[PDB]
Design a protein around this motif. Structure first.
Motif, PDB file in Angstrom:
ATOM      1  N   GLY A   6      60.718  37.704  63.211  1.00 18.09           N
ATOM      2  CA  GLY A   6      61.331  38.567  62.244  1.00 18.09           C
ATOM      3  C   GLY A   6      60.918  39.934  61.923  1.00 18.09           C
ATOM      4  O   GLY A   6      60.174  40.760  62.645  1.00 18.09           O
ATOM      5  N   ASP A   7      61.552  40.628  60.967  1.00 15.59           N
ATOM      6  CA  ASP A   7      61.555  42.049  60.819  1.00 15.59           C
ATOM      7  C   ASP A   7      62.302  42.384  59.435  1.00 15.59           C
ATOM      8  O   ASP A   7      63.044  41.415  59.129  1.00 15.59           O
ATOM      9  N   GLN A   8      62.299  43.499  58.917  1.00 17.05           N
ATOM     10  CA  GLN A   8      62.930  43.848  57.509  1.00 17.05           C
ATOM     11  C   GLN A   8      64.475  43.228  57.601  1.00 17.05           C
ATOM     12  O   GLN A   8      64.661  42.677  56.557  1.00 17.05           O
ATOM     13  N   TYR A   9      65.033  43.684  58.526  1.00 22.47           N
ATOM     14  CA  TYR A   9      66.541  43.198  58.267  1.00 22.47           C
ATOM     15  C   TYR A   9      66.640  41.815  58.315  1.00 22.47           C
ATOM     16  O   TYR A   9      67.334  41.386  57.075  1.00 22.47           O
ATOM     17  N   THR A  10      66.374  41.056  59.004  1.00 12.51           N
ATOM     18  CA  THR A  10      66.556  39.477  59.164  1.00 12.51           C
ATOM     19  C   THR A  10      65.816  39.020  57.822  1.00 12.51           C
ATOM     20  O   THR A  10      66.259  37.812  57.323  1.00 12.51           O
ATOM     21  N   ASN A  39      69.537  38.052  53.930  1.00 12.10           N
ATOM     22  CA  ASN A  39      70.137  37.014  52.874  1.00 12.10           C
ATOM     23  C   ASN A  39      69.084  36.202  52.369  1.00 12.10           C
ATOM     24  O   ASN A  39      67.603  36.447  52.637  1.00 12.10           O
ATOM     25  N   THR A  40      69.197  35.067  51.626  1.00 14.17           N
ATOM     26  CA  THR A  40      68.209  34.496  50.950  1.00 14.17           C
ATOM     27  C   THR A  40      67.676  33.278  51.585  1.00 14.17           C
ATOM     28  O   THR A  40      66.517  32.702  51.897  1.00 14.17           O
ATOM     29  N   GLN A  92      66.407  26.326  53.929  1.00 15.17           N
ATOM     30  CA  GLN A  92      64.958  25.634  54.345  1.00 15.17           C
ATOM     31  C   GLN A  92      65.539  24.127  54.745  1.00 15.17           C
ATOM     32  O   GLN A  92      65.809  23.657  53.809  1.00 15.17           O
ATOM     33  N   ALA A  93      64.805  23.714  55.730  1.00 12.47           N
ATOM     34  CA  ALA A  93      64.724  22.299  56.117  1.00 12.47           C
ATOM     35  C   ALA A  93      63.769  21.754  55.202  1.00 12.47           C
ATOM     36  O   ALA A  93      62.647  22.314  55.148  1.00 12.47           O
ATOM     37  N   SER A  94      64.077  20.411  54.663  1.00 12.22           N
ATOM     38  CA  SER A  94      62.975  19.635  53.878  1.00 12.22           C
ATOM     39  C   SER A  94      61.817  19.368  54.684  1.00 12.22           C
ATOM     40  O   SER A  94      60.673  19.271  54.226  1.00 12.22           O
ATOM     41  N   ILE A 150      61.740  30.705  57.123  1.00 14.82           N
ATOM     42  CA  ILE A 150      60.844  31.048  57.730  1.00 14.82           C
ATOM     43  C   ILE A 150      59.661  30.440  56.648  1.00 14.82           C
ATOM     44  O   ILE A 150      58.721  29.919  57.426  1.00 14.82           O
ATOM     45  N   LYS A 151      59.582  30.642  55.366  1.00 13.78           N
ATOM     46  CA  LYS A 151      58.385  30.199  54.898  1.00 13.78           C
ATOM     47  C   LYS A 151      58.250  28.854  54.811  1.00 13.78           C
ATOM     48  O   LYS A 151      57.113  28.297  54.755  1.00 13.78           O
TER      49      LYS A 151
END
Ligand SMILES: O[C@@H]1[C@@H](O)[C@@H](O[C@@H]2CO[C@@H](O)[C@H](O)[C@H]2O)OC[C@H]1O
Ligand SMILES: O[C@@H]1[C@@H](O)[C@H](O)OC[C@H]1O
Length: 302
Positions: free
Chosen positions: A22-26, A30-31, A1-3, A37-38
């Motif tokens: 996005g979708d389930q896989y991506t 990973n974390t 995540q960028a600041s 995204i969030k």
């Protein structure tokens, strides 16, 4: 995540969102990806889970596992959602394309729009009702919908969409609307004016914006030209630029920033390895899911 969240910075200028896909896989591979995204985006478009082949694999039989996940993730994390896409000639089950009877195709078309839209009614900000229905020269693409139903399918689609969920923004999405004067841009503008004048509920025009390196600067004028169609709004829906240079990205961001009808931007992906054009490194985050130069440049332009 960028600041620094570019979505936050864009919204500060009165824009609705700066999102990604996005979708389930991506969202689980990973974390970092879901964390990015969030943290830095504010809207999500299902990369493939809401297309015809993935929602209605067999006539009247729907499969919503994948879409349910994307929608639920977004809703759970305060992200706006753009449904995509209800009518398209690609990623379409053979059972649809084989239909030859007009009334039968209309029945099917309406059933698909209804079942899919109803399932997320009230949770969708904007729907790409129609996708890529124009030939490069501005004329209507001869897809099964056009060949079987004719030009009336446009009215049938939007009108059904409007009634099923009057809270969503009804869009017509297309690529290559990247420069004023381009045949497809003119064809899009002229048709939309016609349709709007006929009472067809078209709330916005979606411009994919899948660019090559150096095509950023021409985006502003295309947006200005699209604004002449007369829709309530417009938006950059599937943005990615080969090379992902800061110049191309800042230009495209400004193209939208300086146009009143442009409500937002949606980058077609988060990090390069997950790009449908990965070989061109057209995204804002790299293979290590770290911010690229272009991301920072966009942030400092806002
Ligand atoms: O295979 C998927 C691709 O289809 C792509 O999704 C498409 C890209 O092209 C655009 O015209 C469509 O609007 C968009 O939905 O990106 C994801 C790939 O996995
Ligand atoms: O989980 C589903 C939800 O996403 C949809 O909006 O409404 C039906 C539910 O089953």
């Amino acid at each position: 995540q960028a600041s620094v969240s570019i979505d936050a910075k864009f919204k500060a200028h009165g824009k609705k969102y700066l999102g990604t896909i996005g979708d389930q896989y991506t969202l689980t591979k990973n974390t970092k990806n879901p964390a990015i995204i969030k943290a830095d985006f504010g809207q999500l478009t299902p990369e493939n889970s809401m297309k015809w082949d993935a929602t209605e694999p067999n006539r009247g039989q729907f499969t919503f596992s994948g879409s349910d996940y994307l929608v639920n993730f977004a809703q759970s994390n305060g992200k706006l959602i753009r449904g995509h896409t209800l009518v398209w000639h690609s990623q379409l089950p053979g059972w649809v394309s084989s239909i030859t009877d007009k009334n039968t195709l209309i029945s099917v078309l309406k059933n698909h729009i209804t079942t899919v839209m109803t399932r997320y009614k009230g949770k969708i900000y904007a729907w790409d009702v129609l996708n890529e229905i124009f030939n490069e020269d501005g004329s209507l693409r001869n897809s099964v919908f056009y060949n079987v139903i004719g030009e009336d399918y446009v009215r049938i689609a939007f009108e059904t969409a409007r009634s099923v969920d009057p809270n969503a923004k009804l869009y017509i999405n297309d690529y290559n609307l990247d420069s004023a004067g381009y045949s497809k841009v003119n064809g899009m503008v002229s048709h939309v004016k016609k349709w709007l004048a006929a009472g067809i509920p078209i709330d916005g025009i979606g411009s994919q914006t899948h660019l090559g390196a150096g095509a950023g600067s021409a985006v502003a004028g295309a947006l200005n030209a699209l604004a002449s169609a007369g829709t309530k709004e417009i938006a950059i829906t599937e943005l990615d630029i080969a090379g992902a240079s800061s110049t191309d990205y800042v230009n495209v961001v400004n193209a939208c920033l300086n146009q009143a009808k442009c409500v937002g931007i949606t980058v077609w992906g988060v990090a390069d390895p997950d790009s449908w054009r990965s070989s061109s490194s057209p995204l804002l985050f790299d293979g290590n899911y770290n911010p690229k130069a272009a991301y920072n440049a966009i942030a400092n332009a806002l």
